[PDB]
Amino acid sequence: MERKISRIHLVSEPSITHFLQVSWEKTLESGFVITLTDGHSAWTGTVSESEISQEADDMAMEKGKYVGELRKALLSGAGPADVYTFNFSKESCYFFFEKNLKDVSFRLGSFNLEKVENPAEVIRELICYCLDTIAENQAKNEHLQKENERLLRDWNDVQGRFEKCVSAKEALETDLYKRFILVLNEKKTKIRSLHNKLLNA
């Protein structure tokens, strides 16, 4: 199950905010559950795969692009491309959303919602889910912060060790060389003395 909560301003009442809860199991195409709440009354409904397919075919538009637009609208993934407006009457239970551009409206979609007898349960479930996400995100962020600290510390330590290594390496060459010189010179003295003794004969 995947869930997304969004804030929509219904065009019947401008100041008050309304909340849209959209849930889908595997992918949005298969159908989704939509619940609209406003703090005192809620409406629940579902849209099945056959319904979305009929909507797309009746729009004579590619299914992929229609799904993209639907996600951009209901899941609030809209950018500066355009604007959408939502409509809902409390007596008909006929929700419908359109995309507005240049004084031209596209009835992007419509649903036939219904009342739910008990709003307390749905409101409480919503708040509970919000809090759960807050907690999970906080914990994961804390753990990632700790990991970042560890990474910084170890990177600094390794850089220090590398500095030591580079400082020592180039220097060590001459320290190696000088005693090669010493041993070679010692054997040199030995050979010269031996030759002098031999010539003394």
Next chain:
Amino acid sequence: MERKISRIHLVSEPSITHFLQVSWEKTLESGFVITLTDGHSAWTGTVSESEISQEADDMAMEKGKYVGELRKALLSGAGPADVYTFNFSKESCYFFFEKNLKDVSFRLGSFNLEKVENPAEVIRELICYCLDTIAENQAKNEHLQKENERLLRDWNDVQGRFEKCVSAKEALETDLYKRFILVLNEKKTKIRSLHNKLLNA
């Protein structure tokens, strides 16, 4: 100005939860505002330095520890640390949190509550704050993940460079030592040939 949300159960309602919001400006010492809601109707309250002073007079113990205990009870919600039970007489409007130590009980504090005229407003406020928190946490997670990826890149680069340096050091060492072995071998051959003439003559 900060504000926290928490979930509490009630003796009267073991199957239905309540949401408590506690909001303070700078520190709990100055005071704060408590609000109890359940999705239908909500009550509010206020506490100031005068009320905490009177309470500390009633119970006669260090003020800061009272502030901390209130902080834990109303914000931390730490069950493992001596669970305490928040009960509420709705009609009498008496919401109190009793502390239940092993074979001991304390009446930690008394409180008064009133019915706000409009519940829907405060219910909306709670969930919009929750959603804003969701957004901020998501943004922070994205930034932190990018930073961690950068750090992993840097770690890998440093490790690779260090390995290259050690390989180079070993290669130079082996080359130089082989060269000196050869030189010493030739010198030894010459000196052995010279010393052979000693036994020759």
Next chain:
Amino acid sequence: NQLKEVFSGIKNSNEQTPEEMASLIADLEYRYSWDCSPLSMFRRHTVYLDSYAVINDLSTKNEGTRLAIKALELRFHGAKVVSCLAEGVSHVIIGEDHSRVADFKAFRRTFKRKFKILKESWVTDSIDKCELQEENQYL
């Protein structure tokens, strides 16, 4: 300068094998007391690292820990890093995890020649001293 010139003059020589190089290095060092240098003092020692979740398992490498940098530093210094825990190993290094210490002790008892068990802090400190610090404190 003259030694440098003569070294430059010769073209190349690659007729030896790494084992022969190690043996010759050791022989020259012992004959002429090389060990006084700040490094090359780990040549006479073979070092094993517990980088494998399973002892003597090359397919369970645990790369991505400070143990890797420790082992690389050991390799730099002059230690003969050994991937397999042979009976000839002289040092075995362990990190913060002491889960398999009993296994290491059992293997040490099994082998004819015993190898002291050493912690990473031993080398992490001995780098500064550039000398073989007493293992008793780090046993």
